Amino acid sequence: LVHVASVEKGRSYEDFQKVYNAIALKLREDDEYDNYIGYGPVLVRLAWHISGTWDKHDNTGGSYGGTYRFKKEFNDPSNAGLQNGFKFLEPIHKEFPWISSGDLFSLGGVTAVQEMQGPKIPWRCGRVDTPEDTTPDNGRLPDADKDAGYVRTFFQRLNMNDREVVALMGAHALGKTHLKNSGYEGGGANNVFTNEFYLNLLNEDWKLEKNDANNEQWDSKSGYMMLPTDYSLIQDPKYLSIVKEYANDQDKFFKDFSKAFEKLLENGITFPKDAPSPFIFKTLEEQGL
C-alpha cells in the first residue's frame, strides 16, 4: 500500500509559510487555553497521534490520509482532549482550504514546536486526504501504565529505535496530563520546548503514588509528574544512558528530536524523486512578526 505525496496544486514554500504564520499567530493570540499553557502542547500531541497510528507492516494508519477528521479516530479514547487542537485548527483550515488535513495537522505540530523555541523541524507537503474507510481502528496508540519493554516493542511498529524513542519522549517536557482525558494528572504548565523532561527524570525525588482515578504515577514534592512509561526510561539501562545524554546536551537533543519528529510525521509517505525539498519555516520572531 503506497501513499505518494502530491503537492497541493500550484503551492510552494511561501504558501505553507503563510499557513505556518496563521497557526503561529493564533498560538500567540489564544493564550488563555488550559490555564495559560496555550495550544502548543496539544498541537504537538495531535501531530503525534495522527502519525502514531502507522503500522510499518502494512502501511495502514499514519499522517498521510488526514483520517483524524473521521469520527472513529476523532473519538478514539486515546485521543481524548485532542478535539481542542482540532478546533484550534478549524479557522486555519477555513482560511486555507487547499491544505490537506494530514498536512495541516502535522504542520500544526511543527509550528507549535518551533514557536515554543524548539528545534527547526523540516517539513514536507503532499499528504492527500483519504476516505473514511481508510481510518485506522482505535487501539494503535500506546498505553501509559506500562514498562520499558512495552515502550520498546510498541515503537518498533513505528520503526523507531531506542534513541528515537527517548528523543521523541522529550516532548513530555510540554504541557500536562488531564485526569478527565487520560486518567493521569499533573505536570505543571510548561510551554517552552527544552530538554527539561530528562533533567526532571534524573534530578527530582520521585514517589510512586495513586491519583484520583486510581492509577499509579510518579510525583515529586516540587510538583512534577511522570507517567509509568516516562519513568521506564530511567529504569531500563539502555534508555537511561540516552536520558543522561540528552540531559547533558541540549543541542544533541534538539537535533535528534528534530530528525525523529520529522520521521514520525513522514512515516508511510513515498516522496517522488522530484518532490520539493523539505521546507524549513521561519518563526514569527525570525520574521519580525
Ligand code: HEM
Ligand atoms: C509511550 C509513549 C507515550 C505515551 C504512553 C504518552 C502518553 C500521554 C498521556 C497519557 C498524555 C496526557 C493526555 C491528557 O491527559 O491530556 C500525554 C500528553 C502529551 N503527549 Fe504523550 N505519550 C507518549 C509519547 C508521546 C510522544 C512521542 C509525543 C510527541 C513527540 C507526545 C507528546 C505529548 C504532548 C506534547 C502532551 C501534552 C498535551 C497537553 O498538554 O494537552 N507524547 N501523553
Ligand SMILES: Nc1ncnc2ccccc12
Ligand atoms: N509535563 C509532563 N511531565 C512528564 N510527563 C508528561 C507526560 C505527558 C504530558 C506531560 C508530561
